[PDB]
Ligand binder design. Structure first.
Ligand SMILES: Nc1nc2c(ncn2[C@@H]2O[C@H](COP(=O)(O)OP(=O)(O)OP(=O)(O)O)[C@@H](O)[C@H]2O)c(=O)[nH]1
Ligand SMILES: [Mg+2]
Length: 561
């Protein structure tokens, strides 16, 4: 920058001179954030819709893997970097911060789900760099693994990437209209990530692609889902790039994708980042100002020292009490997380109980041996959709809790550094959700049911046989549902522990910072009473000089509104 970065540098210099290492680090993080913002755009959709090819054609770089049956098996984040680099994001137990493990940039195009460096631990995602001018602005794309197919996770598993995302591109090729799972996922996704667009891919392959697009637009409007649809051909885009052909690039309609990313993602988020760094600059300056103006008050107004110091002492004590387990904001957080953990599990099992009841009715209303595949498919879809709805519900409740904790902290004045009256930078935990082992892998009928070797010399009456087969199917359904509830509940629990950790770290950092700034102000006010009058004006002038420089930073920051 000219202005903003200078302002950060300028403020950091003042903080360094005042031995405020905490402020220096805070400003270091803020500056790093505005350079590498990581504005994440999740590329979602079912398998083989053209997600990876879209990403490759866009950046004109083969970071994604594209094959006719294989390719993406792990969530992959692509961000800007002049030099190629890559790392695994490997999970730690009990919602602890994930571990970054450097790998050679190649290993990507391999199955990294069992990368040797991970030591059998869960790989949440892969984060790779690419030197694409497109990413220069701070856009980061998340390619998603194949879902919706046999042996794969359900499309709703993609929802786990969205709480930490700023935008979503929903990929569906123009071979046919939206399926019901696609429609359900879109509705769920918009609850978490409102900024989204449909990319209707492979227009070069399907002559009637416009028919599908218009039918999809109609369907979206009937469902009350406000998402734009953008037609595109990655294939045309790729030739356009090769030929440096502006006209062919227009035909691929990729500029429309660029336009959406620019006007609804990059520009919008750049504004929010701009606001936060300006706020970071202002806060740092105001923390420094408190000690300066407190010492000034002690000088210019000696008869007010008792009230000034008593106030500063009071606020310091409150800031210190805020670091104790008994602090109200921490109580609200801890009790809130505990309640939500139980409530999320209660919600899930309620949804599952309703689903199990429906499936059992279906089983009792037919011949299960004539519908085992159809019954299994419906159950898996219903369960996976419920997991998705549960995840959305949990996200909304977690957001509400974080808001309440924020209010509790602020209303306690634990971030206030105004003069008394006188006269997350860590590794994120986002990844694919987990429900069942894979689609089409549950069968209500088990192997050793003995239908061939169960026949006696004499025939079983049908009534009993139906009853037995139906009871067997019900048993397997209830076990499947219970097993999923166990696995999902575990992920929910660890997720909330992670959120708890992130929020706790955040506010303890603020409390320590406030404690420090108040204690410096306190010492400054005390040390001023020790100087004889002969050195008053000399120190005072220096303070007024410091005061002006800091107020200049605040004002400069304010104008950058
Ligand atoms: N004609 C045409 N074919 C495309 C286009 N985009 C992708 N394909 C083909 O469609 C298939 C799917 O490509 P991918 O980009 O790997 O799709 P995907 O969603 O990433 O697949 P998964 O990662 O397994 O979920 C590939 O074999 C491509 O050759 C396109 O724009 N036009
Ligand atoms: Mg792919």
């Amino acid at each position: 920058m000219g202005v903003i970065v200078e302002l950060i540098d300028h403020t950091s210099a003042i903080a360094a001179a005042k031995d405020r290492a905490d402020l220096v680090e805070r400003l270091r993080a803020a500056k790093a954030r505005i350079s590498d913002p990581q504005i994440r755009v999740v590329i979602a959709g079912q398998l083989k819709q053209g997600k990876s090819q879209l990403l490759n054609s866009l950046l004109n770089i083969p970071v994604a893997r594209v094959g006719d049956d294989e390719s993406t098996v792990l969530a992959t984040v692509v961000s800007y970097g002049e030099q190629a680099s890559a790392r695994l994001v490997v999970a730690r137990p009990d919602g602890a911060e994930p571990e970054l493990i450097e790998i050679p940039p190649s290993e990507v195009t391999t199955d990294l789900r069992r990368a040797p460096q991970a030591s059998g631990r869960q790989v949440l995602r892969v984060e790779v760099t690419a030197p694409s001018p497109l990413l220069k602005g701070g856009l980061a794309f998340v390619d998603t693994p194949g879902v919706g197919g046999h042996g794969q996770p359900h499309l709703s598993a993609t929802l786990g990437l969205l709480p930490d995302a700023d935008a979503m591109l929903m990929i569906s090729d123009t071979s046919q209209e939206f399926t019901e799972p696609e429609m359900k996922f879109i509705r769920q996704a918009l609850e978490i990530c409102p900024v989204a667009a449909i990319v209707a891919t492979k227009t070069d392959l399907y002559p009637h692609w416009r028919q599908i697009v218009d039918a999809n637009i109609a369907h979206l409007q009937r469902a009350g889902l406000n998402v734009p649809v953008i037609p595109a051909s990655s294939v045309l885009r790729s030739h356009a790039i090769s030929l440096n052909d502006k006209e062919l690039n227009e035909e691929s309609n990729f500029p429309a994708i660029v336009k959406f990313l620019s006007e609804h993602v990059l520009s919008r988020q750049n504004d929010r980042i701009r606001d936060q760094i300006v706020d970071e600059i202002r806060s740092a300056a105001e923390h420094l100002l408190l000690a300066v103006e407190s010492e000034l008050s002690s000088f210019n107004d000696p008869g007010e020292r008792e009230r000034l110091t008593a106030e500063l002492e009071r606020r310091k004590q409150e800031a210190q009490d805020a670091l104790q387990q008994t602090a109200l904001w921490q109580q609200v957080l801890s009790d809130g997380i505990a309640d939500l953990t139980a409530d999320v599990d209660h919600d899930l099992r309620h949804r599952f109980r309703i689903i199990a009841a429906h499936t059992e009715k279906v089983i009792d209303g037919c011949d299960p041996t004539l519908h085992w595949a159809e019954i299994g498919a419906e159950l898996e879809d219903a369960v996976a959709t419920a997991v998705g709805d549960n995840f959305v519900w949990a996200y909304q409740r977690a957001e509400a809790l974080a808001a309440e904790v924020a209010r509790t902290f602020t209303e306690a004045g634990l971030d206030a550094v105004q003069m008394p009256q006188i006269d997350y930078g860590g590794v994120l935990m986002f990844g694919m959700l987990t429900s069942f082992a894979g689609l089409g892998m549950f069968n209500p009928l088990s192997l050793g049911a003995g239908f061939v070797l169960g026949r006696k010399a004499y025939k079983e009456d049908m009534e009993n046989r139906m009853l037995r087969v139906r009871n067997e199917a019900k048993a397997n359904v209830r076990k499947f549902v219970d097993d999923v509830a166990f696995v999902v509940g575990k992920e929910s629990r660890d997720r909330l522990k992670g959120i708890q950790r992130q929020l706790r770290d955040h506010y303890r950092e603020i409390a320590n910072q406030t404690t420090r700034s108040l204690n410096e102000s306190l010492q400054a006010a005390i040390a001023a009473a020790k100087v004889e009058e002969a050195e008053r004006n000399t120190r005072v002038k220096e303070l007024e000089r410091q005061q002006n420089i800091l107020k200049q930073v605040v004002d400069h920051a304010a104008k950058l509104a």
